[PDB]
Design a binder for this molecule. Structure first.
Ligand SMILES: CC(=O)SCCNC(=O)CCNC(=O)[C@H](O)C(C)(C)COP(=O)(O)OP(=O)(O)OC[C@H]1O[C@@H](n2cnc3c(N)ncnc32)[C@H](O)[C@@H]1OP(=O)(O)O
Ligand SMILES: [Cl-]
Length: 202
């Protein structure tokens, strides 16, 4: 049952994508919903390791990678990386299912997100410049591993000078919402599609 936090490497990309897929439907398995099992992790997980390698970690137990913990200390910096170094190769040759959500199937929402990324959420980026994401496989859930992992990431971002961080959570993931509330994160904004929570770090 022992889980350690280890620095992530490019050798972990495959496992990042797997964990991303297995938790990408508001925290639950999205495999049945996506037609491309890699897009999710290529949009939401892999670029953290490539663009912010000093704040990317995996959780690993005897069976192998059982989660990840990924951060970026500065939203503007990381968007530069996405806009100039990640989204362009991702777009090359990439089918565009059109901007109308009504015709989309499977991973089409993800293709559109790549061609036309969403605006950043309506929050105070000076107060909460850092951000991150955590996802544990069920085998590593329910026993404080998320708590220890969030301690690690909050500390790493604080050590980099970040005064606050925000995280995006699905409104249909009330477990994660309750998890963050319990850690002293407050709700910064809420739409029918997304909740953003934040905490000051210094
Ligand atoms: C910002 C994002 O990354 S959103 C996506 C989050 N990822 C997911 O939902 C993927 C699937 N689930 C997970 O990865 C994990 O379940 C996490 C990260 C959400 C939580 O990590 P876990 O290790 O499972 O937390 P655990 O359930 O053990 O609870 C840890 C603490 O929070 C408390 N807590 C946890 N969930 C809740 C809750 N839903 N409501 C109130 N308190 C809660 C627990 O009682 C415990 O309290 P304690 O430290 O005082 O004893
Ligand atoms: Cl979520």
């Amino acid at each position: 049952s022992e889980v350690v936090i280890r620095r992530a490497t490019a050798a972990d990309h495959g496992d990042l994508c797997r964990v991303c897929l297995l938790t990408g439907d508001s925290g639950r398995d999205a495999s049945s919903r996506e037609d491309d099992p890699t897009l999710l992790g290529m949009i939401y997980a892999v670029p953290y390791q490539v663009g912010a390698p000093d704040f990317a970690f995996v959780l690993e137990d005897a069976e192998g990678v059982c989660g990840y913990l990924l951060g970026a200390p500065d939203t503007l910096s990381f968007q530069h990386f996405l806009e100039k170094e990640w989204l362009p190769p991702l777009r090359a040759g990439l089918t565009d299912p059109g901007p109308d959500p009504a015709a989309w199937q499977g991973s089409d929402w993800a293709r559109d997100a790549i061609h036309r990324p969403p605006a950043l959420p309506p929050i105070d980026l000076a107060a909460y410049p850092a951000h991150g994401h955590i996802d544990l496989l069920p085998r590593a859930q329910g026993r404080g591993v998320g708590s220890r992992a969030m301690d690690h990431l909050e500390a790493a971002l604080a050590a980099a000078g970040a005064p606050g961080m925000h995280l995006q959570v699905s409104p249909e993931n009330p477990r994660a919402l309750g998890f963050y509330e319990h850690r002293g994160f407050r709700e910064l904004c809420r739409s029918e599609d997304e909740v953003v929570v934040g905490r000051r770090l210094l």
